[PDB]
Design a protein around this ligand. Sequence first.
Ligand SMILES: CCCCCCCCCCCCCCCCCC(=O)OC[C@H](COP(=O)(O)OCCN)OC(=O)CCCCCCCCCCCCCCCCC
Ligand SMILES: Nc1nc2c(ncn2[C@@H]2O[C@H](COP(=O)(O)OP(=O)(O)OP(=O)(O)O)[C@@H](O)[C@H]2O)c(=O)[nH]1
Lengths: 347, 120, 57, 320, 63, 98, 52, 99, 26, 459, 49
Amino acid sequence: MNPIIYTTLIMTVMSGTMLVMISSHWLLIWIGFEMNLLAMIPVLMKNFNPRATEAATKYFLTQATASMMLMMAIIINLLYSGQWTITKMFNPVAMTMMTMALAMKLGLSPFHFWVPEVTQGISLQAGLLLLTWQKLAPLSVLCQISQSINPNLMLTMAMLSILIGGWGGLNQTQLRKIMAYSSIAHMGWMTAVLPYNTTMTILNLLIYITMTLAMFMLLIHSSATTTLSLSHTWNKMPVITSLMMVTLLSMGGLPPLSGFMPKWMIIQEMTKNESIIMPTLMAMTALLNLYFYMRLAYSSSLTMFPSTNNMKMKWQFEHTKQMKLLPTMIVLSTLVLPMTPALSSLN
Amino acid sequence: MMSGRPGRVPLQFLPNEARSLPPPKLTDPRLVYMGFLGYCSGLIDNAIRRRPVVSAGLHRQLLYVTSFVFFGYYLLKRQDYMYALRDHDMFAYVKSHPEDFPEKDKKTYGEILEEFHPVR
Amino acid sequence: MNVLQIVRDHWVHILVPVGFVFGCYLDRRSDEKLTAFRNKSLLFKRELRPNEEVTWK
Amino acid sequence: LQYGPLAFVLGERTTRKLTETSKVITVDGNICSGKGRLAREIAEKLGLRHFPEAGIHYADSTTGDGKPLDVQLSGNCSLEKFYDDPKSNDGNSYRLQSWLYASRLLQYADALEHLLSTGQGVVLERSIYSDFVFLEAMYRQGFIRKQCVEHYNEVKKVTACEYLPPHVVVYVDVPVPEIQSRIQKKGNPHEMKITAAYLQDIENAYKKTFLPEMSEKCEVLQYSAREAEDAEKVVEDIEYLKCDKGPWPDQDDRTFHRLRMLVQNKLEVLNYTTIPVYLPEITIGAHQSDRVFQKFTELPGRKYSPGYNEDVGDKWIWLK
Amino acid sequence: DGPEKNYEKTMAILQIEAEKAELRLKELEVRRLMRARGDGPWYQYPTIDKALIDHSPKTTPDN
Amino acid sequence: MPLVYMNIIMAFAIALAGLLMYRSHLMSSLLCLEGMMLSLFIMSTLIILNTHFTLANMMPIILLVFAACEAALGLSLLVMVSNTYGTDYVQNLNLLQC
Amino acid sequence: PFFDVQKRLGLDLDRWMTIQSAEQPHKIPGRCHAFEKEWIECAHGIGGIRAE
Amino acid sequence: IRLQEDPDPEDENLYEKNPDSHGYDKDPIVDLWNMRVVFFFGFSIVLVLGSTFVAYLPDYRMQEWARREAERLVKYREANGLPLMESNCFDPNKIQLPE
Amino acid sequence: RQWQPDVEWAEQFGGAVMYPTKETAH
Amino acid sequence: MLKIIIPTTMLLPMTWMSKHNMIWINATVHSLLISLISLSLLNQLGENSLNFSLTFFSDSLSAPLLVLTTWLLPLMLMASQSHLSKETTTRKKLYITMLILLQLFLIMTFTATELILFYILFEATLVPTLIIITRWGNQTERLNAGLYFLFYTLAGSLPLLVALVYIQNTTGSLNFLIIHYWSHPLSNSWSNIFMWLACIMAFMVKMPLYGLHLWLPKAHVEAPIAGSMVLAAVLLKLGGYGMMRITTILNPLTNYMAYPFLMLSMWGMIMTSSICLRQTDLKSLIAYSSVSHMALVIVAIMIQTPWSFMGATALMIAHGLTSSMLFCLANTNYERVHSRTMILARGLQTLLPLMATWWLMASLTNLALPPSINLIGELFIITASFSWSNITIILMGMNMMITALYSLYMLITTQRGKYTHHINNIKASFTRENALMALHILPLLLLTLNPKMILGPLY
Amino acid sequence: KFYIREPPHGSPDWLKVGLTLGTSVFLWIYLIKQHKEDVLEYKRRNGLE
Ligand SMILES: CCCCCCCCCCCCCCCCCC(=O)OC[C@H](COP(=O)(O)OCCN)OC(=O)CCCCCCCCCCCCCCCCC
Ligand SMILES: Nc1nc2c(ncn2[C@@H]2O[C@H](COP(=O)(O)OP(=O)(O)OP(=O)(O)O)[C@@H](O)[C@H]2O)c(=O)[nH]1
């Protein structure tokens, strides 16, 4: 891809997301979604392998189904209310239909099998983009319309995302798949906290965005895609694996690392809303995420693995890609807990 | 909680009124800790690039801590303003609704019948 | 004797002592923020000394 | 600024600098078949620069002072052990072949970067496409196991396809018995201990897969020993061939950008040279890898990033 | 230091933390009330602004 | 809540069911998607024409505008699956399962 | 809107089409202009939770 | 065995090179200096001086104050004949009994 | 010498999934 | 407490930049001055807890444990450079950093004022211990050890977090002083029963209670020596300390649900002790003995009697010292033999007379020979339990009996016999370990002389 | 010297270094000026002094 073309496509993805997060008209929000979908496929197809074609397809048809469903909801709302403004749904059917219409975009419900597939098929950089930037728009729409959600549906969605993500992550050695399942689990956390206080949803989303950025760019700088290849990084470059394990402990949410602050704050919120079984359930089932986080950490830094002799030349040559914002990203990824009350800035 | 409060103007850090609050002190432990994050970010940056993490690129580390402190100051001012707004909306709503905030006819422990549990 | 090497070797040592002094300074600069009840507890509520204008620093 | 996406956005192309004289050549042949001689002759006759045949320490030449690092630190294998004791459980032979493959890979990478950056043509002694002749010739001689051969093929497919074949390649045809006599007269005791069947197998593997599959990728120039003796005629042959075969013509500036991106990142080039396959002569143990990496770190100029090591004579590190 | 040190320090700490505690309780109750009724500065929800409405005489008289 | 709306909504429902079920090909699913789009256009047009929301008649046009764009992108995806696969069927599209 | 840039810049991008009572071309009234106008003028600034 | 591994290093005892080894590190001078610092700080100023500290704190739990007020009120109550302690720790008169 | 992972320990999860079944197959 | 926090934090740069040879010396000496500074913290007001600031306070329960940790920190430093000699300087510096971060987290835990902050640092002790156990471990199931330890701790930790935030919403604050002064009676509601279970089971997991105690025979047995002693000596005390803090707002319900767990410990302390008798490894035997002693501390906690609390605190301190010393002795013998079965090297009393002694009073203190603080801490709990219920005594009376058996059994089977002829690597006793057991033993008898300090807040 | 080729950062870039210090001093004196403006403005807001 011509670099200018790639820049324009990225700008169009960002412009679609911005149009979603700044427009009041429902049609304009859908137009932003459409621009995002339209510009996302070539980014995946950048490397042009059959894996990329497979993943880009599976991405497309799911998103297209979700967007058409979103139109069905918008049109029903207009029919029953006569308003395009993004305030609240005046027809229960329209909203209990858009809840999953906006869900396949996030990929949390049983509408989640597409996420690991697309993540594994496409390249790692576009995987970072898909798992970080492609979630602000539907989450923004959900935040705007959170006033009129059916809490039972949204909470069931969040529970299923958490449970299946944590369980599926236990049975993959490819980094892209277990990161997709981790993203599903974090989607479940944020979507669970969504109906009560959207500020905690924003805080968890920001923490997840920065921390997944740090994790993925560490993966890119390590040039690893399978567990064995990542384990081999210790001989060539040990500081990457050392930061890997700390960032994985943050993935699991072990305090005093940054990853606890959302998991903590979310639990503080819904227990204020008389919800006690749900926070305990999520707190216990995050251990499934933690298990494969520690499995990845064990065979990356905590136990040095059989290396390859040709790495004698690999140590001889340094890196060239700068990986901008990485050292800052690790810092906000591990130690921001003492500045927890700063979440009031979001509110 | 406050995204729907009347009078809010979107997309601007401090809404002018916040200057009536005491600005956070430059010594503030929250601010200096955010400066510490600036130092740490320099350490990883040198370590991430195979550099003498302590002595390499003094300017780069110096830029890191300075940048963190500046955004640290504005975040702290923004942080304190919201908490001040939370208290303002609280007490104003408390005064505006006396019936929903009853007062308690204060009495001492000598008249409270607090049951005692024999610890056996 | 190469006293510059002496200081370069022995400047590891000063960190904990200066940290101790700083810690003492700080938790001294942690009671002046809690003078809300100086000579106000009824048990120790005594008069204010003519030459000593506070009960505790 | 080094060439990146920003340079293409700015307008830094490479079809502009690349001309007809910008050629990448490899002069290939049997052992001591005069390939280095003829490569040098075509080099300074056509005006093109010359990178010598990549060996164990060519990569050692690329980085730092260029002195050949310790054999243990630089791939713990020696050509002398190959020549003296061919069949042993330590498997120095396949380690030799793999390290030579990766060294020639980086040699071709630098060569491609050269004529895609400054436009000056490049000449070489053998390359990746002639690298397999050795490994197959050895394997046919009861030398290495087929698992090593399959690891070699899997590394070749995933670390050679991203590169593109040369412009022209010259073959110096010297008969194998003449090669045996030449090694007799050479004098080095290690090359005495050679199987003539191995030399005939090198010749066979050359003109059975290398030259045939070459002919469909670029233009081949088979010269006999006497024919390649008169270098003027071979250089005037390579001048007038057609220079119109292979993927070189149908090579847009965007694929030029791709190949420059690939060559400029050496860690990318040899990223798949260390794929996890766990071969008996390839897995350096955890303890051995730890100690050897520490030894490489204590070696001067290999502890910090190139240009930051204070022990070697750098300066301004504290504002660098 | 003397016992009065700890006595007055504990007075200040206890007063400050008790104020924090019942302020938190008041926060919870106020949030519940304002979310339930909406007659307060926060928890307001967006509604269509009236200035968008056009009052000029249309083609149909009894619009 | 009148009658024609029932028929258009029901047509959209069957088109949603048809999209969410594949049999062999990729073109058929895309056709079912554009049928969903057709039902959406007819429904929205009916709604806005009935309500005399004159400023909103552009909305079905923009619907069709992005409709054609998605159809084009989907069939280019099918072009690539045919180029790397010879055919367009989806059951043989399984290389990403592991 | 999530990040209402329109009110910040005072620029109209989609608010003209949001409601049926807005300034339509050639002053064509909506079918239910009067009811929409009354409902909108009723619950303006009162709050989206008090409106119901 | 498919894994190039060095032989396990022998368990190297410290005494073979300097017999005076204190079991701290290889170099005798820094080994000995670590000896001096531990045998100084662990025992002299922490074990001994610390024991003088803990044996000689100021008033602990005000037990001496407890005794020196205790015999005072025993003197008072036993002299005046009042029971030396009251079955109630708080005056029943000021306590308003329910119902 | 503490146990450092060897080849057979590495292969315990290096491929497909680390929980192999008949569904994993090949 | 920043007169102890700030120097501990600033101890990190010293090791992290010290030379290749000075890290051990500098860390040891400056940790010794840190312990000296924390020795002051034994200064305790009669009844008022020393409230240094809003977020930091100490009383007669937190201060002895804090002094124990600070005095302990040089001991891992002295016990580690034997098995850490052949390592890169950066790796050694990080091992030291893990130890300092562990001690720092323990100090903030013991001096914390709000229950949520206590939970934060209490659990946050997991990470440095996890790194120590996993990376620097030498045995096989160290990787399994880390998983078992982390998951066992967290499975109780998270419900505790939910209970604490619920308490904050309901009561108003998690501050210890508020929840004690403004304490309210707890009704026998089943939701309150589950709240009590959430507030109790985390600490009882780290106690450990019988049954869910499998993380110690699979964690302490595997960790490097420094990790092993910091685990057994203090990290076990975390649950007891937390329970002592939390039973203020857990009454009068406790008694009704005290019945299952109490006897679960009371019976359990027998089985563990029996498991000690038929052991094969020294470290496993010490771990099971630690489980039994901590179960006795559990019983002391759930009696909720003043005497029970004082005996509990004394037992925590004495058990920490004794377990650390026993683990150090086991490491010395194991390193000398490079194996851990307690049959490979026996009859070493003659070869190493000072080790023979160190083992003798290590066993004696483990056996609770009076008037050592171990014996008085045990006996106070025994008397409190007898006051609560008489029959307890026989079970109690069984324990030390079986304890005494194994308390001498290993000493009989490791030094009190005939040496093994084929082994010869047992060299002269390096004075490092002998000195280390000295710094273990003399404070034990010193505190025996004046047990009013380790007696707890009830004294 | 050691490296046959010139190093990527061997001789430091006077340019980027110059901007680094130039922006850092900017951030510092803007921070100070802002703090003084806030403290004086807060003093005159509620009429404290
Ligand atoms: C108060 C300021 C403290 C810091 C500045 C002063 C430092 C010295 C403090 C007093 C020391 C008195 C005894 C000095 C003995 C010196 C022996 C010696 O020279 O050892 C040097 C050596 C390291 O090698 P090198 O330095 O190169 O010298 C040998 C070259 N062939 O071998 C070595 O082992 C190095 C020296 C041994 C280590 C000495 C202990 C260092 C720390 C001592 C103080 C600890 C307490 C600090 C706080 C006190 C107040 C509370
Ligand atoms: N195993 C192995 N050895 C190789 C390979 N390429 C080159 N070598 C060795 O590198 C040296 C190449 O020598 P040649 O160039 O054939 O002959 P020469 O004696 O240098 O003389 P000229 O051909 O005239 O330069 C010999 O030791 C080869 O065995 C390869 O792919 N594999």
